[PDB]
Design a protein around this ligand. Sequence first.
Ligand code: NAG
Lengths: 208, 208
Amino acid sequence: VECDFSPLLSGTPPQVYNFKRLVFTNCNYNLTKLLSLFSVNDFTCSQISPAAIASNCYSSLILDYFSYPLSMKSDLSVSSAGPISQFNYKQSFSNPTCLILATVPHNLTTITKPLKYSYINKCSRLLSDDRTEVPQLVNANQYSPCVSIVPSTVWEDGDYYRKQLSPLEGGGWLVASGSTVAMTEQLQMGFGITVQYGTDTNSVCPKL
Amino acid sequence: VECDFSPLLSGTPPQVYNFKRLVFTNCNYNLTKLLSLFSVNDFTCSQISPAAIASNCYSSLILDYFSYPLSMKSDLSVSSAGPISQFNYKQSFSNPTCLILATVPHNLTTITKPLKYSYINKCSRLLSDDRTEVPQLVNANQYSPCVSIVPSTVWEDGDYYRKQLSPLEGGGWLVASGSTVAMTEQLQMGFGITVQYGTDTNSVCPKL
Ligand SMILES: *[C@@H]1O[C@H](CO)[C@@H](O)[C@H](O)[C@H]1NC(C)=O
């Protein structure tokens, strides 16, 4: 009962490529209660509406959250080759999904701002001819291949990261670069919601 | 006239974190001559080519040199994943740069070898909540913060270095650790060249 959204509200939210995932089964939610704490700037979904997602019964509810600047809202779409959607964060194309951009108010003191917003601007793989670069696109529900060599906070805008791969990995080099965006007055976050429907398993139902 | 590259030839070159920086203005260089003294093993550039950096006029020419083993060439190509560009040395993002990895030949007698190669493997900041490590990484065209606690040669591999920082710089600790690599028969060095272009001030020109 009463699925718990506190860990979203405690501490510094990770950057987009290090998004923290919360999974909910066999409990009951009030989504609009959580969103009342925030200034909601954007709310868009796919195969579901904002009204429907707050009042439907699921077999599973996944909620990713991270720090995200409102400047880069257009990067959060697969239509455009934005670095975020190619290399940092990508939602399932086969489940109903929603994406929420929100501003943490000042009265909400339990969330703490990082120094800045970081993100991966490139994650590619160098082939054995040492000439071809192949992009390494992030998959749905997975972190980027390049998170192993990119720190949780980009130190300097334009930093470059590389890792020599073993024969078991396929050879070549894994190359990444990170960029940073200046912190805003109030922290701005992203929230990705995914839901699954079952047959009898629909055990995440709204509270009333 | 008379850019002077000879101090690079007299004495013992420092370690990578103590790189000696020579700044040249209003003179005439012949870099090909300098490079003939050595047995160059790698010549890599950014926003400039080796042909171009030898035959162009600049408003400033910065030359850094230090002792560096060739077996750590991989520790260079990783850059912000490895500790050399985190803690020891990082060239400009904003001006064009080249990095040359060279061997001292025996004919060169005025360059004496040091005991071993030393580099900083960790330089972080313990807070006063006595776990908190916050790394203190290097910026472009700057030295590591932890030089002030690290000797010119790391005595033994793994040595730790701590100094408490005063309340007026902030309070807590500054810890660092060092790592060593056995000296080779013939000294191996590394050269970093950075160039700036001026409006009319491009006085540093090649010799004709
Ligand atoms: C959720 O909580 C809000 C107040 O924060 C309330 O207005 C709303 O009716 C609640 N919704 C449900 C489904 O319990």
